[PDB]
Structures are given as structure tokens and as C-alpha cells.
Design a protein around this nucleic acid. Structure first.
Ligand SMILES: [Mg+2]
Ligand SMILES: [Mg+2]
Ligand SMILES: [Mg+2]
Ligand SMILES: [Mg+2]
Ligand SMILES: [N+]
Ligand SMILES: [N+]
Ligand SMILES: [Zn+2]
Ligand SMILES: [Zn+2]
Lengths: 163, 365, 365, 163
DNA sequence: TACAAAATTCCATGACA
DNA sequence: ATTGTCATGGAATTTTGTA
DNA sequence: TACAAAATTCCATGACA
DNA sequence: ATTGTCATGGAATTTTGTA
């Protein structure tokens, strides 16, 4: 029954390793399954601890009912598992090598990789400072389905930085 | 000269008949219910009033009671009040005996991200090397982000805000005139982004009430969570942030989180009332909830308040007054009345200051 | 157990009929105007209320709005209020929302030298090596003596007072509980002389209002006399003393000097009204002037004041509260109500403290 | 006409030199002509400057219309003269070697000398600390004329230290 | 068409600077 | 040139369950 | 047995801690 | 065991000088 809502499901994945920017190498990527809203956190490794430090920041603003990811070692560890049980998050794994996430999220996760590469060339090492700009761009991009931007679906208003 | 006429029994405007006026010791005297008093020549009166006032720099009645011991003349307080208005010392040292008009209750911002209020709390007891907290409150929703810093600096603010505005960019940020926000580095950071900077009138934290009021809650919550324990606040900030953002305002019947997102996250005791509404239905229930929220009105004026008038003489309060030195600046003119509680003055001397009336007193006399 | 009865349609005191109560997911549920809510077993309710309250240590309504998201049961706030009254942290950290009763206006002492009020002002900017002022005010007359000291010490006080009491000896000296007056050396100095020592309740300078109020005037006068100039206050003390003692109180229509001596000295603008009365006639005009002086009455109580009742739980305010630590002491009982504004408590734990109600809050719930 | 009043006339004189107490040697003696009230100030010399420092203390509580004294060098100096003109005090001198002051003041000035000697023997060097005690004694002593004490005539009440 | 008690709302009070 | 805010808990008012 | 203006009183406001 | 105080200057009220 229940129609899809924000905070229902956060899809997380790692992008990296990238050329070192401010001594960081990876980007944890969180996308909200219903809105397409996207948070990006720069980490030093694709490790449980990096994931937890990053997710601690996000989850102090909103906690998802479900985190979905691939069977990356960082997400399947029992530290990460005990972390999510503490916050009453259910963990959901896509089967190995058959990584499914909803249609909208795939298209988003695609935009990101490209959006990154397009500006992670020319300036391959200054990408840390650009994360805020990248994130806004993503979150204020029209979905051809809905023609609401993730920002609009999340906050229910227009944004002061349209694209 | 003008005293000559009197003893000769002729009338003068001011000096009542029925009292006999006589000469003794080369001074002119008068018999009065009170007693026998000297009437000084008009050319002496300013000096006399000055001597009386100068003994202790007394106000009207106390100055008058001295003078009345020895002298009488028509309209003594009129002359008394003239000195008081010219006593530089009494003017810059005396307290006001008139309250500011009623506070304004500025409209709630229409939507989230319209206006951010920001302030630093601290110094706090060192935690993990950190001493201060950057507190950012969305005007509309009350939603608050907390960042721990090592100093209340521009660079710290910029670092913290680049993280925040990586989620949304505000139209306006309001702060007090603390060093960290009035730096030109901060201005440029804001101009880069189309953010407008809006500062409170100097030394008036009521103007930042949204955040200051929020600082109270943060500190109160930290306090409770730290009873018994050593003050390790650094680890608690995230917890506090979350806890506060998901706390109900008894008068609104909503949490800041609710006002920002229109649905609860996966937190304890999450509200489910809209489980069957589609996001869209929900989001317009939200647009309706936001516009209908309680708004307070301004209180009655107190019996003895004053409001600022263009051209009136006022005095700005001395901010950090040294020991044994005047609490007030010299008189200045109101140039513009921005609202009944905020004013522009031509000061010391002379630059335009935008100033809160709470930091003003009207010059008396 | 007690929930079993309900789904079977039988009535229970508290649970209204007309709402249908059903089973789902092994939990008992109820359909309500608000929505569908879970009714927990009574053995779970304390824990639930605790979890809600603990998220941010919220008060009644804010705690209730959480719980109401998921649960319903008879008399929820009754249970909410029970936790709030047992939350050690909320009790010692929350502000009071109830004012003290109206201040008392203790009788003016009947005659000069009946009661001295004394306090130190300072530190002031060094003058001739001096930093503090001993201020002594006669309760009845307002007459004030000023002594400059290098520290606010017992020895300084004793040196100064041996000079003063070389003119008259007071029945009572009232001071705050500052180190200089609570020393046993001071007690002995007083007992040597038949002077009674009377101290104000701790951290409550209103109780020494006669002197504190006089400190204002001294400082204000020094300030004016020092405008422009370097702060050389040491030479001005005598001048200030004299000036103030011969200043009229607009409401009394007398100077302290007048109230003490019943005639003016040879000072500027000296009053001559009694030039023809013999000292004796004058001195009984004085006895009449002293007894007839204006006495203020206590103000109306504010809408929401509290007064202390023997056996009531109250909390003493924490004097010098460290950063991020509770502003209140744990609960204590009122043992005696000395007057409606002063109280004896059995404290921490347990000694008798005599305490001002302004430094108390009643324990809520 | 005018009946005699407090502050009408202060008679001042020096007693000394005495054995050194706290390195002081003289006592300036001020007696109010109408009440018989007595202030005592310990000085290091019978000099204008000592007199002025002492009298500065007294005159910050009440100023006499007239100070009367003998033609002691300290009182006849022009510093002391300029001092009194500043405070609008008139100076009055008794002729030399014929030192007249009212009957009541002579009797008082006598009591003092004796009162001093009676306690400035046995303990000839501890007299500084005793000045407060001496002063009270004097000021709460019944005048056989009036049978009011100086304290009573000055303040118009009974004192808390009667004698 | 009215009751007592529970639920809700009102709002002074104080604390953030 | 800009502007007070709002959690708290007794008391006051209004709603509720039952008649 | 009445008026306008001066004189006096009232009293909120803020500052001493 | 102890307790608010009072100068200040506009406004409100009362007194005054003249009729
Ligand atoms: Mg991966
Ligand atoms: Mg600040
Ligand atoms: Mg003190
Ligand atoms: Mg001699
Ligand atoms: N506004
Ligand atoms: N009393
Ligand atoms: Zn002045
Ligand atoms: Zn609590």
C-alpha cells in the first residue's frame, strides 16, 4: 500500500579511488530512493570506519528506514551491521554481481559518475572543493519523470539555486 | 535695575503683590510663607543655579531644594531645568527613566532557506581541542545545524558553511556584528554565492533571538546529558542536533524536522499520520501547515515608553565602559526612523550608525 | 492481562466504549479520531514515557506529542508528569517559571546608630595605592562615611571602623557574607563592643539595598567629577562624602545630614528655617521629623508568584555554576518560613541554610 | 538674637608632645562650642599641615562657621588662613597669653587633659588605640548644666554606650 | 442538555546573549 | 543599514464521554 | 467661586550589587 | 539565622494669585 516516501531507502555506494584531493580518495554516495536527493561525503578509504564517520554526519539530520548497497566489504562487515541495528536501520543487500537499485537511482548514479569525470578532468585534484557545487547541481536537476527536482520533492519549495 | 522698581511698590510680571519686598544688607528680600528669602538680580541667577547643581550634580527637585534654602525668584525650576540640560556630565552619566517602546515581532520567513540565523556559542570547556560551536538556524523551520570549532573565526565559518550550503543555499544569513561575520572574507564568500548578509544593530542580541534562543536549548540539553560525567560535549553535538530538530514546539505542534521535510525520518516515536498520502498530497499539506503557523503580536507599550522621532536628540549607550566612566555617549540626532525600534543616528562624529532604541536614551531637557 | 478483557468487549474504568479495540501484529490497537494507536500493557508504559522523555528531556506537552504519535492509553499526561518529577537532570537544569512573591519593605530603623549597613565597592582603578572603598550607611538617616582601602579585608574594616565608632557605636551592623565580615576576627571586634552582627542571606544584595543603593550614588558622583580627567578618585572621597550627605532626597525633603543633626553645617545653601528655635525646640522638631518620614509599602504580587510553605520541596540556586553544569541544587525541604521572603532549608546534606526565596525555585511535579 | 547652635564654633587646640604611640606625638582637640562634643585627631607635629590633614577629615562631615584657637603658629599661618577662606570658615583668635573660650569648653578641655593623663600613665605609649574609647567617654558624660550629654545635644537621641 | 474530569490552550517567567 | 524568541508547567478554558 | 499656570507630588525605570 | 532602595524627570494632581 504505502506510497514511496523520503527516508524510506538510502542507496549508498563508493566512487573511487580518485586522484588525491586534500588527501581524500573516495566519495561515499548516498541517494534517497524516493526523491533522488544526493549527499556526497569524501573519505580516505572504502572502509567501514570511513563509512560510519560519514554516515554519522548524515544520520544526524535524517535516518533512513533502509540502507541498500552492494556486498562491498565495508557494508557487509559486522561493525557496520551493529551500527545500523543501533539506529534501527534495516540493511538490504543486492545480490553479488547483479547490483539492482530502482530505475531512478541508476540514472542518478550515472549522472554523478559523468558529472564527476567531466570536472574531474582539467582539474583532477581540486575536486574536494567542488563537491558542494556538484551536489547542488544534482539536487536541482529536473527529473523527466515528475519534472520536480530532488530539492523540490525533499523540501516542497523551489530552490534559490535553480539549474 | 529691574529689582529697583519692586521696593518702590510698582508691579512686575512674575513677582506677585501681597508679599512685601524690602532691603537688608544691600540684598533685596521677600517675606514668604516658607520664610524670608533673597531675590537675586537676574544676572546672578544662572551662577546661583550652577553652584547649587554643582555640589552633587543633583536633578531638578534636589537642586531646587538647595536653592530654596536661601533664594526666591519667579519660575525657579524653569532656570533649574535650563542648567540640567546643559550639564555635559549629568547628560552622559545619568540613567534613563524611560523604557523603549514595545518589541516588534518580525514575520516568520515564508519558506525554509529564506533566512539563516547564525551565532557562535563559547568558549566551552575544551573538548577534543574544540572550544566553540557554530549554530545555524533556519528562520522558517527552526531546523538547526551544529558545527564545533576551535575559534569563532571566518575560516571556521566558511569551512562549516561550505558543508551546509552543499545541501541548500539560503537567500539571507543574519548574524550579529561579531568579527567572524564582518570580515570582508566572509562578505566575498557570501557574494560568490548570491547570499545576502544582514547584520543586527550593534550590541543587541534580541535581534538574533531565533539563534540566541536556540543556544539556550542546546546548552540546556548538553547540560542534562552531561550531569555526573566529565564535560565531553564534542561527541554529543550530533545527538543534540538530531534530538532538538525532532523536538515538538508545544505552541506550533510541530518539530523543525517536520516543518523542513513534511515527514519524519526513522527516529523514535515517528509520526505516521500521512502514511497514505502520496508525497504530493503530503507536500501540499505541508505548504498549508507552513502558512498557518502561529505568529505572536507585539506587547502593549509600558506606561512610560518613548519612541524615536526624526530630529530628536538621543544618546547611544557606551558599549564597554571603563570603570568610573560615563555609561552614555554625547548627544546625537535621529536621522531616520527605520521602524519604531531601529534608528539611524548622526553620531561621534559624524558617521551614520544604525542602532537599536534599546541602546538609546532620549536626551532629557 | 488487563488488556485481554477489552477486545472481548467488556468495559474497563478508563477505556471508553464507542471505540473498537482490536488485535494486529500481537499488539492491541484502537481506532481514534486522531488515528489508529497502540495501547501498551501497563507494565510497558513507564518505559515508553521514559524513552520519549529521554530523547531531548522535554517537558509535559513536548514529551506527550511524541508518545501520542504511536500510543494511546488512559490519562497519558498523568504518567508523563510522574517521570518529569523523577528526572534528576530536568529538575536541576530547568529554569523556574514562577516569580518570587512581592519584596518586603523593612521598617526604617527608629533612630540613628540603630543599624549600620556596610559594603565594599571595588576594585577601582588604583589611586594612591588604594583599590577599594568601605561604605558605611546609617540605616535611619542615610548618612554615609567613606573609607579608601587597599583590600576588602577584615583588618582594613577594623581600622576604618575604629575611626568611625570613635564618634558613636551602632547597635547592629548589617553586611553581606563577604570574607571580610564573616571572619571570626570581625566577630570578636564586634563582641568587644556590644555591636550585633547581622548578615544577609547568601548571594542576595537586595538585602543590603540601603548600601548598594548608596554605592550607585557614590560611583555616579565620582564618574561626573572625573569626566575628562584621569581617574584620581582618592582625593575626591571626602568631597563626595560631604556632597552626598548634604544632598536632598526629593521624597523625604531632607538631607542625611539634616536627619542626623537636625541642623545644617556651614555648607553652601545651608537651611536656616530654625534659626530662632533653641537647640531644644529644634531637637524635638527633629524627633518629630524622624518619626513622620515616608515609608514605602510592598508591591502587588505578580500574576504567578509562589510563597514558601513549611514542608515544601524547593531548590537552591547554584552560586558559581561552571560552564555546561546545572544552575540548580538538588531538592531540599523548607524547615521554617522566617517571613514570606526568607526561609530555612535542610540542604546538601544536611545543614541548615537561611536563604532568600529569590535564590529558590519550587520543585515542579 | 540667634540661640547657640552646633557647628557655630569649633575650639581647637593641641595637646602634646606625648610619648610616641604608633609614631604619633600630638592630639589636635576639637570641641564644639554649643554641644561640648569632642573630636580627637593624632598628629605627628603641631603644624599647619598636620592640622589641615586632620581638619580635612572632620570637615568632610561638618563644617563649623567659626574656628577659634590660640595664636599657635600653626593656626596663624597663611596656609591655614587660605584653607579656612576656601571652606568659608571664619578664623577667630584669642589674644596672646589670655586664652579665652566659653566656660563649658574650658571645663571640657580640662576633663580631656586629666582623662588623658589618668590613662596615659600605666600605659604611656598605647594611647593611640585608646583615642576612640576616650572620645566616647567624653561625649557621653553628663553636663551638670543641661544634664544632656554632648552626644544627646548633637544627635538628639540617647547613645548605645552610656557612662 | 448538563455534568466532572480529562484534554487542550493560555501565558508569565526566565534565559540565550 | 533594520526587527526578540520560545520551552516550561500551573491555571484557565474547552472538549469529551456519558446521560 | 472659577480660571491658567506654577508648584508639588506621583511613580516607573533602572542601577547598585 | 532574616527583610530592597531611591535619584530621576515627564505626567498628574494640587495649590496659587488674581478675580
Ligand atoms: Mg562499490
Ligand atoms: Mg555572538
Ligand atoms: Mg559586597
Ligand atoms: Mg596650643
Ligand atoms: N517583517
Ligand atoms: N521590619
Ligand atoms: Zn550635572
Ligand atoms: Zn529529563
Amino acid at each position: 500500500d504505502r506510497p514511496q516516501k523520503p527516508f524510506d531507502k538510502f542507496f549508498i555506494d563508493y566512487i573511487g579511488p580518485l586522484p588525491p584531493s586534500q588527501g581524500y580518495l573516495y566519495v561515499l554516495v548516498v541517494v534517497d530512493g524516493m526523491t533522488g536527493f544526493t549527499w556526497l561525503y569524501p573519505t580516505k578509504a572504502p572502509s567501514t570506519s570511513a563509512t560510519v564517520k560519514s554516515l554519522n554526519v548524515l544520520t544526524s539530520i535524517a535516518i533512513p528506514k533502509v540502507i541498500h548497497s552492494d556486498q562491498g566489504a565495508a557494508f557487509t562487515s559486522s561493525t557496520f551491521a551493529e551500527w545500523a541495528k543501533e539506529r534501527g536501520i534495516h540493511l538490504e543487500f543486492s545480490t553479488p554481481y547483479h547490483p539492482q537499485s530502482s530505475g531512478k537511482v541508476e540514472r542518478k548514479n550515472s549522472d554523478i559518475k559523468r558529472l564527476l569525470t567531466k570536472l574531474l578532468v582539467g582539474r583532477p585534484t581540486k575536486w574536494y572543493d567542488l563537491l558542494p557545487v556538484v551536489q547542488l547541481a544534482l539536487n536541482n536537476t529536473y527529473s523527466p519523470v515528475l519534472k520536480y527536482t530532488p530539492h523540490q520533492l525533499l523540501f516542497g519549495i523551489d530552490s534559490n539555486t535553480p539549474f | 535695575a529691574e529689582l529697583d522698581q519692586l521696593l518702590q511698590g510698582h508691579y512686575i510680571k512674575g513677582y506677585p503683590k501681597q508679599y512685601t519686598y524690602f532691603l537688608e544688607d544691600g540684598k533685596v528680600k521677600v517675606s514668604r510663607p516658607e520664610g524670608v528669602k533673597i531675590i537675586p538680580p537676574q544676572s546672578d541667577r544662572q551662577k546661583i543655579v550652577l553652584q547649587a547643581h554643582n555640589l552633587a550634580h543633583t536633578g531638578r527637585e534636589a537642586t531646587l531644594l538647595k536653592i530654596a534654602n536661601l533664594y526666591w525668584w519667579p519660575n525657579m525650576r524653569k532656570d533649574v531645568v535650563k542648567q540640567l540640560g546643559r550639564c555635559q556630565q549629568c547628560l552622559i552619566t545619568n540613567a534613563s527613566n524611560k523604557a523603549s517602546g514595545p518589541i516588534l515581532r518580525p514575520d516568520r520567513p515564508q519558506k525554509p532557506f529564506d533566512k539563516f540565523f547564525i551565532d557562535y556559542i563559547g568558549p566551552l570547556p575544551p573538548s577534543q581541542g574544540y572550544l566553540y560551536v557554530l549554530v545555524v538556524v533556519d528562520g522558517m523551520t527552526g531546523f538547526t545545524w551544529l558545527y564545533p570549532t576551535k575559534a569563532p573565526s571566518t575560516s571556521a565559518t566558511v569551512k562549516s558553511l561550505n558543508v551546509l550550503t552543499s545541501i541548500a543555499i539560503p537567500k539571507v544569513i543574519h548574524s550579529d556584528q561579531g568579527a567572524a561575520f564582518t570580515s570582508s572574507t566572509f562578505a566575498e564568500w557570501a557574494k560568490e554565492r548570491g547570499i545576502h548578509l544582514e547584520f543586527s544593530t550593534p550590541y543587541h542580541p534580541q535581534s538574533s533571538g531565533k539563534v540566541e534562543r536556540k543556544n539556550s536549548d542546546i546548552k540546556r540539553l548538553l547540560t542534562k546529558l552531561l550531569v555526573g560525567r566529565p564535560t565531553k560535549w564534542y561527541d554529543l553535538l550530533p545527538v543534540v542536533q538530531l534530538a532538538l530538530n525532532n523536538t515538538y514546539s508545544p505552541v506550533l505542534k510541530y518539530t523543525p524536522h517536520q516543518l523542513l521535510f513534511g515527514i519524519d525520518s526513522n527516529t523514535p516515536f515517528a509520526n505516521q499520520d500521512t502514511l497514505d498520502l502520496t508525497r504530493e498530497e503530503e507536500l501540499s499539506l505541508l505548504q498549508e501547515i507552513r502558512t498557518s503557523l502561529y505568529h505572536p503580536s507585539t506587547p502593549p507599550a509600558s506606561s512610560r515608553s518613548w519612541s524615536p522621532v526624526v530630529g530628536q536628540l538621543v544618546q547611544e549607550r557606551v558599549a564597554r565602559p571603563a570603570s568610573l566612566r560615563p555609561r552614555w555617549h554625547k548627544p546625537s540626532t535621529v536621522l531616520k526612523v527605520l521602524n519604531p525600534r531601529t534608528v539611524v543616528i548622526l553620531d561621534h562624529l559624524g558617521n551614520n550608525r544604525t542602532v537599536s532604541i534599546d541602546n538609546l536614551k532620549p536626551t532629557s531637557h
